[PDB]
Curated annotation (Swiss-Prot), chains A, B:
Modified residue annotations for N-acetylmethionine: 1
Active site location: 235 (proton acceptor)
Residue spans crossing the bilayer: none
Official protein name in the record: Pyridoxal kinase
Main location: cytoplasm
Modified-residue entries (Phosphoserine), positions: 59, 164, 213, 285
Binding sites annotated in the UniProt record for pyridoxal 5'-phosphate: 12, 47, 127, 232-235
Gene from which this protein is expressed: PDXK
EC number: 2.7.1.35
Amino acid sequence: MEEECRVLSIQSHVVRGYVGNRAATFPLQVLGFEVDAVNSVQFSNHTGYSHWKGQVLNSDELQELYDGLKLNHVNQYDYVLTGYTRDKSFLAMVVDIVQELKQQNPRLVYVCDPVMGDQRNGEGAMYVPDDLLPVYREKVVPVADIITPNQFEAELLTGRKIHSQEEALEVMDMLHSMGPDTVVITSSNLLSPRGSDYLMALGSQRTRAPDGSVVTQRIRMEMHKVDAVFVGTGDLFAAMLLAWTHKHPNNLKVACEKTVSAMHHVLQRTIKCAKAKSGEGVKPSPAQLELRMVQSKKDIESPEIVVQATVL
Amino acid sequence: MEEECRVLSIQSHVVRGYVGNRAATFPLQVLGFEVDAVNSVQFSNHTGYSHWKGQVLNSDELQELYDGLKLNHVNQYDYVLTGYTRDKSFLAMVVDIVQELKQQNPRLVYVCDPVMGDQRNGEGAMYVPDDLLPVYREKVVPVADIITPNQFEAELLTGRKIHSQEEALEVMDMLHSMGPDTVVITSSNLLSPRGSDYLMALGSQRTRAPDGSVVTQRIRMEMHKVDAVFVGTGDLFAAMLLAWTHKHPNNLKVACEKTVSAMHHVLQRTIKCAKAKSGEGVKPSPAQLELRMVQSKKDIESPEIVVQATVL
Ligand SMILES: Nc1ncnc2c1ncn2[C@@H]1O[C@H](COP(=O)(O)OP(=O)(O)O)[C@@H](O)[C@H]1O
Ligand SMILES: Nc1ncnc2c1ncn2[C@@H]1O[C@H](COP(=O)(O)OP(=O)(O)O)[C@@H](O)[C@H]1O
Ligand SMILES: [Zn+2]
Ligand SMILES: [Zn+2]
């Protein structure tokens, strides 16, 4: 894009692979946004791998950094994107940070990816310490303008469990109620209208006109499911979601469409090469499932629409 | 490019700005290389700012990561790019790592940016602890395939001081002697044939034919000096350098030309905006001088040649 948009993305960093800031920075950059990256952690790779070693930051390490920026008077953003953290102290502090910033720039938008767990093999389990659920639930979502939760995470926040599209739609109403005006469930089990081989994603948006009226947007999408478990997809999503909604602040359908389309492309590209390195009748390993970002540069920049959002 | 090239870049990371891995990753990426980033440090910004806070890694923290990669068997590269470190332990280990990799892969190329100091305001001073000079001088350069030293650093390594083009050409010879076969002094004071308002850069390359003959390449370049002190330029250079020489392994002139051209563009773009935010008759601050990476995406991908290298 051509306007001056700065984004303070606070997420995980992996030496190898695309997950965390690693999966979010490129997209936003090739998209035109100026990114300020704070890495909550530095691991060798993502925990999906059998082994993973690395380091983590605590509230003080985050303070040091922001203080640094603070001291130089360069703490001015237009957006804020947050993700992976294992430190409740760290997360809490972000909230304080986000707010001081929203005080300076009332126009700031805070995209929150409530990264806590995975909804795989049925219902799920979190992949971060439990002490964050409360923090995300009570201090973070409140102050978020856009959330990109997991069916799982989304159940985790609203404290319920989805078993129908409706039930889903309610959690989005509820979630909104907690703060965000734009809410997206990146995916879920909901018995898609067609095929078990299809992922469904729901996105709600609520706006208050200067006349008091509240214009509501509700969209459902059926994505073509890939026979694999990728990691970092969520992060790429939000990062791109942050870019399209900026383009179409009142077009959740469109913003989500581009976004999920880019998503499809990237993913199709990945599984292709993945199955190539694994061989026929052999399952791609997490290492072989890393997102083929660089290769998808053009698709990210201008994704052809391959998913048409249905307006509920 | 269209082949599978992985690069293990080990350098500094700044939350805000383009410097260290922040300045090196994007270029290599939009250029086609698959990057693996290890951040030797994470600071708010670059030390050129009045204040800077952040954390640093030590040999153990680097080991962790390497071990992490090791354990998963993904410690396989085609290149290695190294830069900013303040830890001699860190630097040393990097070497051991480099060697273990060169054993596994004899075709690996190690680009080494001997980042230690600045040659500004006449003669300079290092911006890193002294204990690194020895390490760079005795353990790193020996094993490097391509160095991109600072007139200052270059002096620092060969232990001398340049006061003529010759004096320069010698040091490159001396440098080669220590190990690298491709050597580049990104810049120096040498009284350019035209203008004080011109930066001179010298690039030497030495190849050993299968017939025993040693083909030598020597090129000098006159760059148009910008009325400012940027930071991260060096890092950008090496990264791009790493990319063109990969394209033209036997065309130091060409590889250098593209790179430096890109450099010019990027830089021209930067000083322009910079002076805009500072105002007429007011000097751009280090914050206002951050490279305009993103904005230069296209120029990086295909830089028009605006500097013609002279073949000494
Ligand atoms: N297996 C898959 N098949 C098809 N699309 C996927 C698949 N996994 C992720 N996606 C896409 O990437 C995004 C990430 O979804 P999700 O699995 O909920 O991510 P995460 O759990 O990482 O937050 C979704 O918008 C979806 O369209
Ligand atoms: N003031 C400047 N004017 C013109 N070109 C510059 C200027 N500063 C940096 N560059 C370009 O960026 C590259 C980085 O070079 P240099 O500044 O010597 O390295 P470093 O950033 O490591 O000190 C240079 O080789 C040159 O091509
Ligand atoms: Zn997620
Ligand atoms: Zn340098």
